[PDB]
Amino acid sequence: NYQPTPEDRFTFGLWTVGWQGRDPFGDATRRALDPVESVRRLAELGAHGVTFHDDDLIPFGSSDSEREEHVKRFRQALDDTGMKVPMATTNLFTHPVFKDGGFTANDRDVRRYALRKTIRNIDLAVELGAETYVAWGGREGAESGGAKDVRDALDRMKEAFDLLGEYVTSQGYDIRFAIEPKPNEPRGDILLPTVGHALAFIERLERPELYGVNPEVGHEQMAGLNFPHGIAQALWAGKLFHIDLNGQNGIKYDQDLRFGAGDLRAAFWLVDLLESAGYSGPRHFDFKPPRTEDFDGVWASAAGCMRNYLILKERAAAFRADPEVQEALRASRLDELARPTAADGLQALLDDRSAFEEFDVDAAAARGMAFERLDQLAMDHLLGARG
Amino acid sequence: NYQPTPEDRFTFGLWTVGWQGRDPFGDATRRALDPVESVRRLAELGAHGVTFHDDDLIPFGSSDSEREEHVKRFRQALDDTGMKVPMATTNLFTHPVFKDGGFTANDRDVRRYALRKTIRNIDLAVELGAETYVAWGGREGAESGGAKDVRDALDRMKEAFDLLGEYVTSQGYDIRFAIEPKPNEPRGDILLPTVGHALAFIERLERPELYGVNPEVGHEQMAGLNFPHGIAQALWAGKLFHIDLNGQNGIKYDQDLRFGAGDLRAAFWLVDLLESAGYSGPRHFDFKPPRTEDFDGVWASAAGCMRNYLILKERAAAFRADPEVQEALRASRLDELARPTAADGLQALLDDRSAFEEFDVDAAAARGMAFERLDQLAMDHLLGARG
Amino acid sequence: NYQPTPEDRFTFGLWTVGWQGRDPFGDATRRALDPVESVRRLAELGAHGVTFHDDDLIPFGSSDSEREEHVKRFRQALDDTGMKVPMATTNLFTHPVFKDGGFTANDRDVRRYALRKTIRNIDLAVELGAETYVAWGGREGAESGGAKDVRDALDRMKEAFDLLGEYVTSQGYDIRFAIEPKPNEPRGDILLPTVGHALAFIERLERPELYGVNPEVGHEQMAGLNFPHGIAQALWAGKLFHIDLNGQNGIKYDQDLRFGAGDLRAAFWLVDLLESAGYSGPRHFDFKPPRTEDFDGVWASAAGCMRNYLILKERAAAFRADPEVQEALRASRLDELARPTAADGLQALLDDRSAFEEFDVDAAAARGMAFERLDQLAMDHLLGARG
Amino acid sequence: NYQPTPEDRFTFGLWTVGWQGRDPFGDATRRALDPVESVRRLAELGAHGVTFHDDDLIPFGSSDSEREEHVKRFRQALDDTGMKVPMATTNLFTHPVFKDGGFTANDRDVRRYALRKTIRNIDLAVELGAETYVAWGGREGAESGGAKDVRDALDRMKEAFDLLGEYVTSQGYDIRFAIEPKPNEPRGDILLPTVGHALAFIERLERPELYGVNPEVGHEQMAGLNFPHGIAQALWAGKLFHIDLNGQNGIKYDQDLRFGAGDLRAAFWLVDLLESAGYSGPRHFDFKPPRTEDFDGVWASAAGCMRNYLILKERAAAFRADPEVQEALRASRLDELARPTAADGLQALLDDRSAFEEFDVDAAAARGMAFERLDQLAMDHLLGARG
Ligand SMILES: [Mg+2]
Ligand SMILES: [Mg+2]
Ligand SMILES: [Mg+2]
Ligand SMILES: [Mg+2]
Ligand SMILES: [Mg+2]
Ligand SMILES: [Mg+2]
Ligand SMILES: [Mg+2]
Ligand SMILES: [Mg+2]
């Protein structure tokens, strides 16, 4: 039946189901949602948690009484539904003061204002019980070559993340940070565009154990890269703290389709990788219900994300647990890929005559790899057509 | 006149001017070149050095007498022309034994054979006086999801690079290693596809001071990324050991056009970045003369690469040394970008009331950035139309 | 000095300089512009005309008195400045009633409403003296495969364009129609995505002499196609009625940069093609001033478009009028490309023994084409470095 | 069981299963196949026919005795297996005499040689009983802007196709012509890059009833376009004469994967479109077995193409024949899309007050479209998870 359970750890953003449909060529098609109503509806669908921007919960320019009133209503809804908040983030892209950037704006006072806004939201997020803080560098980039000195911008971004790490260490919080890469949209070229650039940036920080990545399926597919390879490098580094799941149709604008739409085979291999590696964080959906839909379509899209994940998880487990698949995996020598190359050592490899002087390159080249048979078994298990 | 001089450090690969024109849909249009003739012609054009694959210099399957004869003729040509060899590399992609991979092939004996071939070529490269060794992971990837376990492949690639570093340390050589990223072509998805992935991989190695990157303009433009941003992150990390210059028209197959063709504005900003940062390595051209050309067209393309670089270097220096440009750079607050954000410290930033409580967001948002005026000055200096 | 003159026929849209900066992730950074002020400023910069959407001039839901008042003020500004209106268009994408489409919406009453709105705007455009009407099919497409039956949608689009042609024929107007293609943004896939699809659609209409295309540089570059090839096929068909000039950096979202930015070499070849073919329509700029700029940056961008066109026109004329270039064009046999293949006829070609039986394929294959020398001369003329 | 039958009309090219694995960076991994052996193996798998290039069957430079001997052996194998030949084509891209082009080469004598070669192969194809002749314009394009005058090239291509039509009309053959579009690879930009450009070219020919298109899934996906939309426009024009099925992973080089791999959802919607429209031509597979495979992998890939088509055909028929799907299609108003917009006429539409003056735009905008529910039903039917 593929019914979601709270052990699946499915979470949704408030900006996802609360999107009003304002695109660059059109007005809003839906009215605004109350966050309390969003929590109650998502708890009815069987979700585990919600995430938020600071401006999603408290409107910009609110007084302290309005701030504490919104926080009190939102914690009341969380206590009534039993829902959790596992991640929060700050909005440094909507207001026109951030048009040049946030942490790497050319104006020093804008950079200081962005740091103070982030610190205030980190205090609220620890108050609500979040475990991961996400920084999205949305306005950090340039449309032209001379507008932004990139080495200086990387120095300012390093300084900002070092200050945030110093603050959480001095306060004694247990929250960690995560960086969300994206290649373009809305700037012409965004700093730290991929998972690899984000990981290489994290290794230069002062306390590199507090920082990880938060990759998104759509953002890695906008650069034509392969999302399971990117996720596997992040897992190899030990830095996958949180993940965003959606869909995307090739290299174009950010579509943010529901999960399973877009590249279905890549979604299958991604669910295979996460269930095999034992990733235990939240399964966060960052999608936009299309502006042709009313509220019933919104809730149908939100249910469809979780249903597609549960179907792909069942099919991937059935593919790995099949004896003919295990025979094909031995025939393609994946078990030999898992073996060490030279554990006997460098001197033994240099003295091994079977490794250069007496190695039959023609006999080694004549062997096929049977990858097409393996892939056809994977396609049959995905489509349900084993027979 | 833009005449190349040996102080410019222009180098060419033997595979560049020696390409016979065999593309996937056509036969060769040019006969094979003698490497001695290539050295003499490139010294006549005013180049500084040549680079080589092992199979470019010594054909596959050659005996030891043929090996030493080819090496003796090639060093004789280098001594007669005064040309140098600043970089070498090994060929782990042409022979059909490497169809699944080289360092990360599924076959253990193929991995051991690839390591022994690389070690032999490293000995030859130190004998010829090279300073940088380049590893291109061309066959390391997959066309399908189940063919390659990517975490295990990253373990084998780490093991191979650690063994090579152990060998050069035990021999006492001064040569360093460099990794060339590429997103696809000829596999469907290649491991370590960008500069960011390569840098993040290098930080996990055992002796990370021996390894850097060798980025190529065309390969970063095949993923839709921005090459000056990638080069600037590599310079910020201190890992730019060598660079490949060519041209590319957007996201498609590897064209390897001559330098200056493709994206001319990006070429301008790249030359600006290298001359500003003071990169002192070789300027290596990795281009393919198109198969419609005869040998006169080959030599005209090779001269055109160096001419386009010298023109762009003159225009970029004239753009930076202009007082109206310096006034526009102050008006866009690049000098304020170079200033530290909070050097007074975290506690002073938290107590600063002008940074959150009394900060005029509307007055800060009303200021323009004058980026379009700056970019129009850059375009006028590139086109030569200051007036 | 490259100063624009009214003989250059430079026109701008009101939505171009009137864009407030609202992108999908941010609010507006600039206040709204009066159309009268836009006409006066563009006449001061040296433009020839303006174009408009119906909703740019008259706000949605306006009464008839407000309609005639806006029209009277706008014609007064046109009479005071001497500016013209050579093109108009209708807005069928902003209001949420058009969320599924306009001419090809699934709702019949929405299709009838869209036709009536277009007919009313055509009457206004003939009243202002326009010569070309532009239909942009912005919302005509789908995000999913089952949402839109494409053959039925093409039937409805044919029916709508046939009705508009019947109306202008019955009224005796002299205005013509033009279709603007675009591959995606804001739908996932837009019907009639390229110039070729638009031309093939036009040939199936009832009165195909009234319909042409209106191609845009950015929209053809979002699909990775080559804009001079597309423009040359439209000129070969005799259907280029109007053209939109802007810039675009590869395959991503619609950037709408100023002209000359993006792909400078492609801009050079486009200006070469239009000046060689003698295109006599307006040179229309459809660009967006970036949201980091204030009004001085807006007017600087608008001046920069015209300046870049005048510089490229001078350099292309100097390239064609050069005797060494003419010698290189004879060496690459472009004059032989202009000659007919078999004007002697099919029977003479079949009896010609020099064409198959006695044709030296090796001697024909040995000849080079000298394309690289020709391209280096073109690059030298573009950069101003002939010497 | 999804077993192929001769009523399915599955055909394969000889170049598909006969590909030796020579890619631009590697040598061949498989030996050459006898065409007789290819016919016998494909008849054992359950195919219906084969297609060929002229150089696939008769090697270049063969004498007349060798020509008639190869033809006699090949017709003997066709008579023994009962296989047919429904399509043929000529090779104007491999030999280095065609490096600049074929029908639109800059050399007049090369153009005449290409026409004579094509006419000889057309005689052979009618002798073998083919019904469609395919022209692929592989070398017709340019790497640079000045190398090719595109209007003159379009004149020469029109002249060549008019001569071929005149020849088949004078001989009284019943064969038709088809044009295969492709955006790039191996030239930088190929003339007639998409289906739309090919259709617009066909409408300018002298006898436009003899010419159609032959689209390929991979070639339309290399430009980021949507293949069911392109196929539906070709069916709307009545020009779909033949089709090529393979797979492709986004915008990169021509992968030519087996069918079903790549974009599985797009493959599902394509099979839905062909079975709904009743296309009765051959289902031709143009794929390359990957160079990691031996001959068993070749035959497994060839069987996998037909199996994936039969599975998708069953799932699409089950999706269309479902009552809940039919209810959802009525709720998304596809039946209202099939209705004519104004069959009452232009005057009745202009006098209809319910169409502009009394039309409730807010009530029309408030209705949802239920596209997400429809798409989730389609995904459930594709994955086999109706429950
Ligand atoms: Mg996104
Ligand atoms: Mg996200
Ligand atoms: Mg390359
Ligand atoms: Mg290279
Ligand atoms: Mg646009
Ligand atoms: Mg436009
Ligand atoms: Mg292909
Ligand atoms: Mg094909």
B218, B267, A227, D385: CA torsion to nearest 10: -80
B289 cis-preceded (ω within 30 degrees of 0): no
CA gap C193, C204 in Å, rounded: 17
Contact at CB, D25 and B257, closer than 8 angstroms: no
CA gap D333, D159 in Å, rounded: 47
Packed helices B323-331 and B371-383: angle between N→C axes, nearest 10 degrees: 160
CA gap B7, B11 in Å, rounded: 11
- H-type helices in chain B, by residue range? 14-17, 35-45, 54-57, 64-81, 108-128, 150-171, 195-202, 217-221, 227-237, 264-277, 295-320, 323-331, 334-337, 346-351, 361-365, 371-383
CA gap D6, D14 in Å, rounded: 18
Residue type, B30: R
Q: Is A219 annotated as a binding residue?
A: yes
Write the residue in A251, A369, A379 that is nearest to D293 by C-beta.
A369
Please provide the DSSP assignment of B1-20 as one string. Answer: -----GGG-EEEEHHHHT--
Instruction: State the sign of the Cα–Cα–Cα–Cα dihedral A75, A79, A81, A84.
Output: positive
Q: What is the set of active-site residues of D?
A: 53, 56
D137, D142, D147, D151: CA torsion to nearest 10: 50
CA gap A257, A247 in Å, rounded: 4
Q: Is B142 helix (H, G, I), strand (E, B) or coil?
A: strand
Beta bridge partners of D138: none
Closest ligand to Cα C185? 5
Longest Cα–Cα distance of chain B, Å, equals: 82
Contact at CB, A99 and C29, closer than 8 angstroms: yes
Residue written as tokens 């996990």? Answer: B204
Length of chain C: 387
CB contact, 8 Å: D293 with chain B?
no
CA angle C117, C120, C126 (to 5 degrees): 135
Q: What is the set of active-site residues of A?
A: 53, 56
Closest CA to B17 of B6, B9, B36: B36
CA gap A325, D133 in Å, rounded: 43
Longest Cα–Cα distance of chain D, Å, equals: 82
Please report, for residues A226, C137, D340, the alpha-carbon distance to residue C133 in angstroms, rounded to integers and kept in the order given: 44, 13, 24
Q: Is B286 annotated as a binding residue?
A: yes
Contact A18, A12 (CB under 8 A): no
Backbone angles phi, psi at B141, to 5 degrees: 175, -155
Closest ligand to Cα A262? 1
Q: Which token pair is B328?
A: 């526009």
Residues of chain C with C-beta less than 8 angstroms from the C-beta of D277: 151
Instruction: State the sign of the Cα–Cα–Cα–Cα dihedral A138, A140, A145, A150.
Output: negative
**Which residue of chain C comes nearest to D168, CA vs CA?**
C346
Q: Which token pair is A379?
A: 């396609």
How many contacts, defined by CB atoms under 8 Å, are there between A and D? Answer: 110
Write the residue in C113, C197, C334 that is nearest to D356 by C-beta.
C113
Please provide the DSSP assignment of D226-275 as one string. Answer: -HHHHHHHHHHHT-B--EEE-B--SSSS---BPBTBS-HHHHHHHHHHHH
Method: cryo-EM
**Which residue of chain D comes nearest to A258, CA vs CA?**
D372
Contact at CB, D143 and B257, closer than 8 angstroms: yes
Task: Give the residue from D376, D380, D382 with the most A CB atoms within 10 Å of its CB, the best one to mutate.
Answer: D376
Packed helices A195-202 and B195-202: angle between N→C axes, nearest 10 degrees: 40
Q: What is the resolution of this structure in A?
A: 2.0
Please report, for residues A310, B281, C159, C165, D358, the alpha-carbon distance to residue C109 in angstroms, rounded to integers and kept in the order given: 41, 68, 15, 20, 11
Task: Give the residue from B104, B253, B258, B264 with the most D CB atoms within 10 Å of its CB, the best one to mutate.
Answer: B253
**D364 CB neighbour count, 10 Å cutoff:** 17
CB contact residues (below 8 A), chain B span 239-258, against chain A: 251
Burial class (CB in 10 A: 0-12, 13-18, 19+), C129: middle
d(CA C240, ligand 5 centre) in Å: 18
d(CA B216, ligand 3 centre) in Å: 7
Q: What is the CA radius of gyration of chain A?
A: 24
d(CA A216, ligand 1 centre) in Å: 7
Q: How many CA atoms lie within 13 A of C121 on its CB side?
A: 27
**Which residue of chain A comes nearest to B346, CA vs CA?**
A163
Residues of chain C with C-beta less than 8 angstroms from the C-beta of A28: 96
Length of chain B: 387
Length of chain A: 387
Q: Is B42 helix (H, G, I), strand (E, B) or coil?
A: helix
Contact at CB, D224 and A379, closer than 8 angstroms: no
Contact at CB, A297 and D379, closer than 8 angstroms: no
Q: Is D162 annotated as a binding residue?
A: no
Please report, for residues A98, A212, C19, the alpha-carbon distance to residue C28 in angstroms, rounded to integers and kept in the order given: 12, 33, 9
d(CA D163, ligand 1 centre) in Å: 53
Residue written as tokens 């008259």? Answer: C58
CA gap D142, C228 in Å, rounded: 12
What distance in Å separates residue D87's CA from the closest CA in chain C? 24
CA gap B248, B182 in Å, rounded: 13
Q: Which token pair is D123?
A: 């005689």
Q: If you ran DSSP here, which 8-state letter would residue D94 be given?
A: S
**D68 CB neighbour count, 10 Å cutoff:** 12
**Which residue of chain A comes nearest to D223, CA vs CA?**
A251
CA gap A110, A116 in Å, rounded: 10
CA angle B305, B308, B311 (to 5 degrees): 150
CA gap B135, B157 in Å, rounded: 11
Known catalytic membership, residue B56: yes
**C63 CB neighbour count, 10 Å cutoff:** 9
CA gap C245, C216 in Å, rounded: 6
CA gap C18, C39 in Å, rounded: 11
Contact C230, C196 (CB under 8 A): yes
Residue written as tokens 């089709």? Answer: D243
Assign domain D1-387 to its CATH architecture.
Alpha-Beta Barrel (3.20)
Please state whether beta strands D49-53 and D10-13 pair in parallel, antiparallel, or not at all (unpaired).
parallel
Burial class (CB in 10 A: 0-12, 13-18, 19+), C371: buried
Please state whether beta strands B49-53 and A87-89 pair in parallel, antiparallel, or not at all (unpaired).
unpaired
Write the residue in B22, B249, B253 that is nearest to D253 by C-beta.
B253
CA gap C21, C289 in Å, rounded: 8
Please state whether beta strands C189-190 and C141-142 pair in parallel, antiparallel, or not at all (unpaired).
antiparallel
Q: If you ran DSSP here, which 8-state letter would residue A146 be given?
A: T
A172 sits in the region (left: phi over 0; alpha: psi -120 to 50; else beta) called left
**Which residue of chain C comes nearest to B304, CA vs CA?**
C376
CA gap D276, D217 in Å, rounded: 18
Backbone angles phi, psi at D107, to 5 degrees: -90, 125
Task: Give the residue from D95, D97, D156, D166 with the most C CB atoms within 10 Å of its CB, the best one to mutate.
Answer: D97
CB contact, 8 Å: D29 with chain B?
yes
Residue written as tokens 């009341």? Answer: A76
Contact at CB, B163 and A349, closer than 8 angstroms: yes
Residue written as tokens 């197959």? Answer: B253
Residue type, B100: D
Please report, for residues A382, D287, D302, the alpha-carbon distance to residue D310 in angstroms, rounded to integers and kept in the order given: 15, 17, 13
Contact at CB, B356 and A116, closer than 8 angstroms: yes
User: Which partners does chain D have (≥3 C-beta pairs < 8 Å)?
Assistant: A, B, C
Report CA B203 to chain centroid distance, whole Å.
Answer: 19
CB contact, 8 Å: C237 with chain D?
yes
Contact B385, C384 (CB under 8 A): yes
Write the residue in D116, D166, D194 that is nearest to C355 by C-beta.
D116
Contacts of B50 (CB under 8 A, 6+ apart): B11, B12, B13, B14, B38, B39, B42, B83, B84, B85
Q: Taking chain D, what is the end-to-end CA distance rounded to the nearest angstrom?
A: 23
What distance in Å separates residue A217's CA from the closest CA in chain D? 15
Please provide the DSSP assignment of A256-309 as one string. Answer: -BPBTBS-HHHHHHHHHHHHHHT--S-EEE-----TT--HHHHHHHHHHHHHHH
Residue type, A276: S
d(CA A245, ligand 2 centre) in Å: 8
Residue type, B220: E
Contact at CB, B261 and D144, closer than 8 angstroms: yes
Please state whether beta strands A211-213 and A189-190 pair in parallel, antiparallel, or not at all (unpaired).
unpaired
CA gap B106, C337 in Å, rounded: 52
CA gap C100, C107 in Å, rounded: 9
The annotation places the binding site of C for Mg(2+) at 180, 216, 219, 244, 254, 256, 286
CA gap A57, A222 in Å, rounded: 29
CA gap C136, C186 in Å, rounded: 12
CA gap C323, C337 in Å, rounded: 19
Q: Is C340 helix (H, G, I), strand (E, B) or coil?
A: coil
CB contact residues (below 8 A), chain A span 35-64, against chain C: none
d(CA C216, ligand 5 centre) in Å: 7
CA gap A70, A48 in Å, rounded: 21
CA gap A82, B382 in Å, rounded: 62
CA angle C157, C158, C163 (to 5 degrees): 100
CA gap A151, B316 in Å, rounded: 18
**D95 CB neighbour count, 10 Å cutoff:** 17
Break chain C into its structural domains and give their ranges: 1-387
CA gap A19, A65 in Å, rounded: 26
